[PDB]
């Protein structure tokens, strides 16, 4: 776990390799989990068919992970701005686009871009403003 966290430690826009790798893993992990629920429920017809679906979901998710990581990191270096939430939006923007492609739908890319990017941007803001998620009870 010390791993994933690393993504945040080094300043954004720097060491994109590690960023992309980490982001790709998270997506892939989600892919596995997502495929699992998708196979446990709404099962397949043959073991192979399901192994394929696991692969499909895993790769698609890994891809959205990569492009998000790559776009955000690169957008940063190029723009010479490491804390501009927009960076992430461009990244989320891209991530959605990959999802759209893997689903072969321009429309999905639309919602995907907006919704996904917005979400990622909010993550950046969240980190920048020190928003706390799942907080301990401090009443």
């Amino acid at each position: 776990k010390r791993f994933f966290e690393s993504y945040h430690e080094v300043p954004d826009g720097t060491q994109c390799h590690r960023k992309t790798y980490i982001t790709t893993a998270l997506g892939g992990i989600c892919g596995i989990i997502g495929s699992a629920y998708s196979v446990s429920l709404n099962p397949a017809d043959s073991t192979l068919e399901a192994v394929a679906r696991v692969g499909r979901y895993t790769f698609t998710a890994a891809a959205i992970g990569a492009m998000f990581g790559l776009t955000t990191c690169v957008s940063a270096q190029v723009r010479e701005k490491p804390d501009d939430p927009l960076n992430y939006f461009i990244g989320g923007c891209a991530g959605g686009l990959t999802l759209g492609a893997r689903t072969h739908s321009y429309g999905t890319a639309a919602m995907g871009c907006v919704y996904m990017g917005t979400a990622a941007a909010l993550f950046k803001i969240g980190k920048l403003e020190g928003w706390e998620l799942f907080p301990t009870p401090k009443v």
Partner: protein, 54 residues
């Protein structure tokens, strides 16, 4: 811009996004085995959620 573009984007899209999401989450075989394994998956993930955030 009125009618189609400003109705397909904000009002209608949100209509579709959900409609589609309910279709996947609610299309369930009804068989117990499937459902139960999903309980298995959950136990596994929660076991981990605790593990990694030990």
């Amino acid at each position: 811009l009125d009618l189609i573009w400003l109705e397909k984007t904000i009002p209608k899209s949100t209509s579709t996004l959900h409609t589609n999401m309910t279709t996947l989450t609610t299309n369930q075989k009804g068989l117990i085995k499937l459902y139960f394994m999903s309980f298995l998956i959950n136990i596994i993930l929660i076991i981990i959620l605790y593990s990694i955030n030990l």
